[PDB]
Amino acid sequence: KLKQDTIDRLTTDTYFTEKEIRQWHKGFLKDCPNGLLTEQGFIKIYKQFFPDGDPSKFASLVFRVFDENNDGAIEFEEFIRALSITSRGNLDEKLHWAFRLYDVDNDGYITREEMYNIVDAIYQMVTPQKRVDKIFDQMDKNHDDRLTLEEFREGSKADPRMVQALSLG
Ligand SMILES: CN1CCN(NCCN2c3ccccc3Sc3ccc(Cl)cc32)CC1
Ligand SMILES: [Ca+2]
Ligand SMILES: [Ca+2]
C-alpha cells in the first residue's frame, strides 16, 4: 500500500501535491497490482498511444531511465519522480533527463551512435543520419566525438531540436 513516509518524501521531492500522488497511486495499483511496473507493461503503455508504429524500442529506452536502481521494475516512487521531472521540471531538469535518455550506456557522454539509436527509436514508434551528424558536429565543441552534459545543455539552448523531439523543450 501507500506508506506515509513515501508520501512525505514525494510531496517534498516532486512537483505533485499529496492529492495528485494519491490519485496516481490508485491508478498505478489498478494497472500494476504488485506495485511493480515492468518493461512489458511499460511498452503496452506506449503501444496504447502509438498503435500505428512500433514504440517497443523507444519505450525500452525510456524504461531504463525511469528504472533508476536498474532492477527491471519501476516501483511507484520511481514512477512519480520521473513523471515529475518530465512533465513539470524546469528547463535544466528536463535537459538533464534528456541527456540520460540519449546516454544509453550511462557513461556520461553522448556518442553519435547513441543519438542515432534514439532517432531510430522515435522513427519506429512514429538523409536522417546527415541531419543528426550536422547537429552532433555542431554540439561537439572540442571535436572528440563525445557530448558531455555541458556540451548537450548549451547546444540544446541554442538548437533545441534534439530535445523537443522528446517533448521536453
Ligand atoms: C522522451 N520521453 C521523455 C518523457 N516524456 N513524457 C513522459 C513519458 N510518458 C509516460 C510516462 C510515464 C508513464 C506513462 C507514460 S506514456 C506517455 C505518453 C505520451 C507522452 Cl508525450 C509521454 C508519456 C515523453 C518523451
Ligand atoms: Ca526500479
Ligand atoms: Ca554513452
Ligand SMILES: [Ca+2]
Ligand atoms: Ca565533446
